[PDB]
Amino acid sequence: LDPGLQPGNFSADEAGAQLFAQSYNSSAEQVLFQSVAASWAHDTNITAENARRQEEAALLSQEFAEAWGQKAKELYEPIWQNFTDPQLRRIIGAVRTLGSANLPLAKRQQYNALLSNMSRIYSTAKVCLPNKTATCWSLDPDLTNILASSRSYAMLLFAWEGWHNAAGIPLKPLYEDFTALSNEAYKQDGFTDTGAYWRSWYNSPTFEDDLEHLYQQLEPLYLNLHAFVRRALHRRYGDRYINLRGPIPAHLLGDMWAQSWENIYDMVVPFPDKPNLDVTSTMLQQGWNATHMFRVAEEFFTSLELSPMPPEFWEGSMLEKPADGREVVCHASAWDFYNRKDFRIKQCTRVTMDQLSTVHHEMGHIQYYLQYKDLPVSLRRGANPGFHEAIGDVLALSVSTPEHLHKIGLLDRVTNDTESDINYLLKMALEKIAFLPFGYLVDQWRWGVFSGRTPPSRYNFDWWYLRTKYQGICPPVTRNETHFDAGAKFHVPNVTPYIRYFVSFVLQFQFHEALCKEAGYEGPLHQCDIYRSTKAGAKLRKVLQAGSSRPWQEVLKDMVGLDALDAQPLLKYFQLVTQWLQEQNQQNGEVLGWPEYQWHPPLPDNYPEGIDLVTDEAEASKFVEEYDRTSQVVWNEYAEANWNYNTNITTETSKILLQKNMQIANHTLKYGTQARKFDVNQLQNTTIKRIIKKVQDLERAALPAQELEEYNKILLDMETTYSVATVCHPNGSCLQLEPDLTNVMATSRKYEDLLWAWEGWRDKAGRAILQFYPKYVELINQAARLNGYVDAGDSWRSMYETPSLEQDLERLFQELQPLYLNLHAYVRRALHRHYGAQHINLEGPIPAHLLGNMWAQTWSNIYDLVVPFPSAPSMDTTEAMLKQGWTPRRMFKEADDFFTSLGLLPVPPEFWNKSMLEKPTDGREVVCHASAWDFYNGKDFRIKQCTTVNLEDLVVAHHEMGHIQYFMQYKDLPVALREGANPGFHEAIGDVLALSVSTPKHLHSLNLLSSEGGSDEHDINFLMKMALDKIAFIPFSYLVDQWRWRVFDGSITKENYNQEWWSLRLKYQGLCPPVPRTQGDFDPGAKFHIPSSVPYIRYFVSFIIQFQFHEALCQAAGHTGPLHKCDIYQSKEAGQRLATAMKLGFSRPWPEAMQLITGQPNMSASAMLSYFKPLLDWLRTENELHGEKLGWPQYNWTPNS
Ligand SMILES: *[C@@H]1O[C@H](CO[C@@H]2O[C@@H](C)[C@@H](O)[C@@H](O)[C@@H]2O)[C@@H](O[C@@H]2O[C@H](CO)[C@@H](O[C@@H]3O[C@H](CO[C@H]4O[C@H](CO)[C@@H](O)[C@H](O)[C@@H]4O)[C@@H](O)[C@H](O[C@H]4O[C@H](CO)[C@@H](O)[C@H](O)[C@@H]4O)[C@@H]3O)[C@H](O)[C@H]2NC(C)=O)[C@H](O)[C@H]1NC(C)=O
Ligand SMILES: *[C@@H]1O[C@H](CO)[C@@H](O[C@@H]2O[C@H](CO)[C@@H](O[C@@H]3O[C@H](CO[C@H]4O[C@H](CO)[C@@H](O)[C@H](O)[C@@H]4O)[C@@H](O)[C@H](O[C@H]4O[C@H](CO)[C@@H](O)[C@H](O)[C@@H]4O)[C@@H]3O)[C@H](O)[C@H]2NC(C)=O)[C@H](O)[C@H]1NC(C)=O
Ligand SMILES: *[C@@H]1O[C@H](CO)[C@@H](O[C@@H]2O[C@H](CO)[C@@H](O[C@@H]3O[C@H](CO[C@H]4O[C@H](CO)[C@@H](O)[C@H](O)[C@@H]4O)[C@@H](O)[C@H](O)[C@@H]3O)[C@H](O)[C@H]2NC(C)=O)[C@H](O)[C@H]1NC(C)=O
Ligand SMILES: *[C@@H]1O[C@H](CO)[C@@H](O[C@@H]2O[C@H](CO)[C@@H](O[C@@H]3O[C@H](CO)[C@@H](O)[C@H](O)[C@@H]3O)[C@H](O)[C@H]2NC(C)=O)[C@H](O)[C@H]1NC(C)=O
Ligand SMILES: *[C@@H]1O[C@H](CO)[C@@H](O[C@@H]2O[C@H](CO)[C@@H](O[C@@H]3O[C@H](CO)[C@@H](O)[C@H](O)[C@@H]3O)[C@H](O)[C@H]2NC(C)=O)[C@H](O)[C@H]1NC(C)=O
Ligand SMILES: *[C@@H]1O[C@H](CO)[C@@H](O[C@@H]2O[C@H](CO)[C@@H](O[C@@H]3O[C@H](CO)[C@@H](O)[C@H](O)[C@@H]3O)[C@H](O)[C@H]2NC(C)=O)[C@H](O)[C@H]1NC(C)=O
Ligand SMILES: *[C@@H]1O[C@H](CO)[C@@H](O[C@@H]2O[C@H](CO)[C@@H](O[C@@H]3O[C@H](CO)[C@@H](O)[C@H](O)[C@@H]3O)[C@H](O)[C@H]2NC(C)=O)[C@H](O)[C@H]1NC(C)=O
Ligand SMILES: *[C@@H]1O[C@H](CO)[C@@H](O[C@@H]2O[C@H](CO)[C@@H](O)[C@H](O)[C@H]2NC(C)=O)[C@H](O)[C@H]1NC(C)=O
Ligand SMILES: *[C@@H]1O[C@H](CO)[C@@H](O[C@@H]2O[C@H](CO)[C@@H](O)[C@H](O)[C@H]2NC(C)=O)[C@H](O)[C@H]1NC(C)=O
Ligand SMILES: *[C@@H]1O[C@H](CO)[C@@H](O)[C@H](O)[C@H]1NC(C)=O
Ligand SMILES: *[C@@H]1O[C@H](CO)[C@@H](O)[C@H](O)[C@H]1NC(C)=O
Ligand SMILES: *[C@@H]1O[C@H](CO)[C@@H](O)[C@H](O)[C@H]1NC(C)=O
Ligand SMILES: *[C@@H]1O[C@H](CO)[C@@H](O)[C@H](O)[C@H]1NC(C)=O
Ligand SMILES: [Cl-]
Ligand SMILES: [Zn+2]
């Protein structure tokens, strides 16, 4: 056994300890030299061959430490603390620390290999997508780069969790075993636990207490910065993920561990316009090279009259990426061979301003070694383990200053711009101030572990609690005791303390302030440099010269003047950013800190399936531009043919239209598929947000081509079936739905013929639709689900943008029941005297085939049988219009006048030349359903009506003009939003401007009626005529879409379609079928919009909200008294009240426009009840005159045969 490796015999005396120590020093540096030599070789020449040597030399070192430690611990430990000279005690104490070696060999292997496994797992940790990806991501570059570079919350979250999953989960069991052995080993050394040993290095009886006091003094700076970043992150990600008062999601801070916020500087940079001064471009033109960069650095130290580099340095240092091309650990490091004769830097230098500063840092280490190289090896270390880095840093700060750069010559003028330095200082603030709490809590956490304050069942609980309490962060996902996120940070599984850095950071600024004060410098500390200040160099040298001989605190007191750490120097360095940030925080009213800490974000909508979705908003903006630009042409093209065909039925126009139909199909699918690639939930431009959400709906196109084909096939089969069904008399005479059968329903008073027509249409048209409905439902439900809805019912109901729709609709309907019930009963009485009790039960629901309409959706056809007062007309308005020479254009002209008096946009000139106001006489065939058309060209707007000169068409004209008016004033929005606030609004506006038309006042104002006796009966007569549609149509319109909703809900099946229909027909319309019906019939097929699969609830909304608007206009127009006597005419303000609302188009939720119009954000039936209040009174009264009893409790009655 080499005497140079094993201690000899020594007494327990100080002289013996001195002789032992002296002997230890001589051999120790020899051993260390061998160890580092191979270390340098492998690190400088990466190969398994050198790895083997490194492994061997390190092994030898341990045996040496074991031999000497063994003797030292045995010899002096009973007396060592009494040795007079602390110098000796320091040396002996270090060697006397055996650590792991204390463990028995079996535990040694377990402990040593265990540590190796912990290290292996961390570096081996791989994160893989939930796909059989060809290659996964490792911690770096992939995971760190993607996490540092990506800004997609979903993507960023997945990477953050995966790393914690792979790294944390497997470490949790192992780390416990380390805890037992680690504490067990140090127990033999004499420390209560691993934590006590690490804290022992700082020789501070109140060390941990000191740090909390330090941290509390820095918290004011940290909170201000935390609030500022919190605000900035909120600007980027939105309140959904950033609670202005709560903690910040750990994964959004730009780095896997949130230990450094540098990567978010691009979002927060003050004065973004001032460029960061980079001297690299000049450095290159200066011909500088890495080798000279270091000699430049050496000159700085010579300016400090410190020791220049030994020639050994120029020879040994691995300044560059070696020309030999052999592999090397390019990460810049400074190496000190304990051989007093040499020290080396390994830079792998590349010419950048950053590396220039880096080199100065590393050289500072070299300078530090040189100054204490004279001390014994045991003392040739920092005053405290954090002390080392600080010295290197303070040197790094001074040179980074542009003042210093100018002194070097790399800058022509030192522009003293506060915006520049604030931008710079803020970058440094994000780089390291954000680090302070993190570095503190990790070792705060570990002491809890080693002390047992955090038992195993709390590894993760205390981790997040501590991480949240100090750093102000919460997890991106709820995490529980199964996890061990502590294993996610390199320093944990590698069991390397973190506290050194935090203390080092405070010492850095603490030293810096001292030298600046020593250098006679004044003013801004961040503008200080120590260059050329020999007096300060001597002070710095003093601190280095002592090395680890003198206790760090003693040296610090001599340097700066204070026996302990303090935050004051650090704050003064950042004073400027401190002041500035508070104002930025003050102006935003930020809540310093994070109350309501128990808050955290929701998971992404499709996590983890949506983690690769594109969230960049700049391209989405351009996307919307191209979409509008292209969609305008396609819809206009579509509209052109669609208009051309609707007026010119010529068969070839249909062929043309079909081809155009394919184009919109092409376009819809093309841009729809592209739209689905944008992730809307992360966007913040509200306009773009709604636009993309809409376009993302692919409707039928979400179905597979085969099923889409099958779906369209079925639609046409149903559409065709309805299109060709007819009812035929026994003689074979066949009647069509319109106008033929409609006239029967409208004109017949014969119970037999009405039933035959109603029954017949339902028998041939109705029953047949069951040939397709079931699969039809299944298919559209499949499509709805593929579009992200629960079912087709959810899909349609979603267009009202309000989840409580059905509840609101329900309440709205209930509020009309008193009126509807009175009307219902009154009509029943009218039917009673014409069809008799044998067919009319005055105490039950009404036979659904007598309401004058094939579907009983509108009762206006029976007005003659229900009129409350005859002698209603003072003049025939039809003959009067004829007498006054009224023409279709004159009719629409009067409407434009009304609209002009209301200050709304006049109709464009081309309208008068391309609209079709009359039945063509050139043999063209027209689709006569009156409607209004928008060509999306900001100039083409047209009306198509088979205009007849009568009052009815006069209402149609205004109604159509209403739509036109609505198109014109939102023409400025992009096509994607050229829609009403909601489906109802568009159809609702149509009535509002028309309502006044039929009032007696407006009727008379145009002399359509000569003066009439001012009877209320004429008002009542008009109001009932209105109610006979406005009211009756409400419940029917409600029932259809509810019936479909519950069918889309799957809650209703074919076995009872008929029963659910009639049950609803009873509950909502108070109706029953005229004759019993069994399965095989499917009455709902009897109404077009069902087999045509078109929603109806819009009409209901239209007939409600239109009355709120009318009241608002009458209120704004100043009208008082009976609401039906209101006349909007020429109200310059009332028009403007609507104008501002219409311009919103579909860009806003309808509650905004609703309020902007009426002053309320909710739909309210009260306006309508008020409108009909007089008629209700009369009808209610009439019920008393006849003693009519309201309701239909006696469900089962039908007309007698
Ligand atoms: C890294 O940089 C080193 C520093 O180079 C200096 O700084 C850079 C930014 C340039 O400005 C460069 O021109 C500077 O020299 C660099 O070392 C330098 O390498 C250059 C060539 O690349 C050498 O140039 C020659 O210099 C001599 C004069 O220098 C000697 O004498 C003076 C005293 O007079 C001493 O102070 C010096 O230390 C040297 O001992 C010139 O006489 C010689 O002239 C030749 O070229 C001219 C035409 O230009 C002809 O007319 C002559 O007849 C000769 O043919 C060169 O100009 C320079 O000596 C050297 N300086 C030092 C201090 O070593 C180093 O090579 C770089 N390393 C890498 C890896 O890039
Ligand atoms: C920890 O252990 C190491 C190794 O034992 C000690 O390192 C020795 O340190 C001493 C100085 O403390 C060094 O002595 C120097 O020797 C130089 C001559 O070296 C040649 O000659 C010797 C034999 O005399 C050979 O062994 C050697 O290989 C060379 O061939 C001198 O030139 C030096 O001069 C300096 O010191 C003298 C006073 O001694 C002054 O008068 C001079 O002006 C000058 O300042 C010096 O004498 C010795 O070389 C080191 N050994 C090794 C192997 O490097 C550490 O000292 C010890 N730690 C402590 C705290 O003692
Ligand atoms: C309803 O829509 C229909 C389809 O758009 C219109 O039908 C067109 O009616 C015109 C007459 O009104 C017919 O004119 C004939 O066209 C053929 C072929 O013309 C083509 O070739 C010549 C060169 O030889 C070219 O100059 C033309 O532009 C055409 O490209 C001639 O041979 C005849 O002499 C006559 O001019 C069209 O044929 C006919 N087209 C179609 C597709 O049916 C109809 O006019 C519309 N009705 C209204 C009232 O607008
Ligand atoms: C330090 O001093 C101790 C004594 O205080 C030395 O220990 C002795 O080491 C020798 C061998 O180097 C041992 O010799 C053997 O002794 C036994 C009887 O004890 C004898 O039968 C054998 O034939 C052999 O000679 C001796 O046992 C051992 N003594 C004790 C008490 O362990 C040690 O060598 C000294 N080391 C140095 C570096 O000075
Ligand atoms: C980097 O590391 C590798 C491996 O540690 C070194 O490779 C070894 O280099 C030596 C010479 O430097 C080789 O030995 C010599 O090879 C020549 C040519 O065959 C022969 O003429 C000599 O007599 C002697 O055998 C050795 O084979 C080679 N490989 C190994 C495994 O040792 C490499 O030199 C290192 N480079 C640096 C810059 O440190
Ligand atoms: C560090 O991790 C390695 C790898 O997990 C551990 O090595 C493994 O150690 C176990 C026993 O400690 C060996 O178990 C044997 O496995 C074979 C199947 O491979 C089985 O047939 C035997 O009955 C037995 O269970 C295992 O072979 C061995 N693997 C290797 C590659 O050597 C090591 O023990 C871990 N050390 C610590 C301290 O956690
Ligand atoms: C702690 O919380 C974690 C989640 O944060 C819990 O682990 C999770 O447990 C569920 C099932 O309980 C796992 O999901 C299931 O996976 C199976 C396939 O293994 C699948 O068939 C199921 O449909 C379901 O998706 C989930 O993957 C798992 N996640 C993790 C990260 O382990 C754990 O149970 C909680 N433990 C305690 C004590 O609170
Ligand atoms: C949201 O994005 C839309 C779409 O680009 C922006 O609309 C632009 O508005 C300016 C005037 O404000 C017009 O000059 C542009 O023509 C509009 N864009 C297009 C494509 O026409 C809108 O300003 C954005 N709003 C917010 C709050 O981000
Ligand atoms: C088939 O028979 C019915 C029943 O006789 C005919 O319907 C009548 O048509 C006339 C006008 O053509 C009406 O005035 C009657 O009121 C209808 N009666 C009924 C009960 O509806 C029908 O016209 C006959 N068709 C043919 C082609 O002979
Ligand atoms: C010296 O030893 C005595 C007796 O064990 C003890 O009371 C005293 O505290 C020791 N001195 C030091 C500095 O530990
Ligand atoms: C920059 O200007 C400020 C003005 O308040 C001054 O305090 C500071 O000393 C100036 N710095 C330099 C380097 O001129
Ligand atoms: C449009 O649809 C037709 C259908 O056959 C197809 O042939 C054509 O390639 C499509 N074009 C685009 C751009 O989608
Ligand atoms: C309408 O057409 C006539 C020709 O029939 C033309 O004189 C007039 O200028 C056209 N007006 C507009 C607005 O196009
Ligand atoms: Cl709808
Ligand atoms: Zn360093």
Residue numbers in the entry: 1 to 1201
Q: What does the literature reporting this entry say, word for word?
A:
The somatic isoform of ACE (sACE) is a 1,277‐amino acid type‐I integral membrane protein with a short C‐terminal cytoplasmic tail. Each sACE molecule is composed of two homologous domains (N‐ and C‐domains) separated by a short linker region and each domain harbors a catalytic site with a HEMGH zinc‐binding motif (Wei, 1991). sACE is related to the carboxypeptidase ACE2 which, in addition to its role in the RAAS (Turner & Nalivaeva, 2022), acts as the functional receptor for the severe acute respiratory syndrome (SARS) coronavirus (Li et al, 2003) and SARS coronavirus 2 (SARS‐CoV‐2; Hoffmann et al, 2020).
A, B (A) The consensus 4.3 Å full‐length soluble monomer map from nonuniform refinement resembled an hourglass shape with close association between the two domains. In contrast to these studies, the overall cryo‐EM structure of monomeric human sACES1211 shows an extended hourglass‐shaped conformation with minimal occlusion of surface area by the presence of a second domain. The domains are distinct but closely associated and are separated by only ~5 Å. The 29‐amino acid interdomain linker (G589‐E617) loop does not spatially separate the domains as it was expected to but is instead wrapped around the N‐domain. Interestingly, the cryo‐EM structure shows both domains in a fully open conformation for the first time, reminiscent of the open conformation of ACE2 (Towler et al, 2004). Although the domains are closely associated, full‐length soluble sACES1211 does not have a continuous active site channel for substrate cleavage. The N‐domain active site cleft is instead inclined by ~45° relative to the C‐domain. This incline could prevent simultaneous binding of large substrates to both domains by sterically blocking access of a long peptide to the central C‐domain cleft through the C‐domain lid region, upon exit of the peptide C‐terminus from the N‐domain prime subsite.
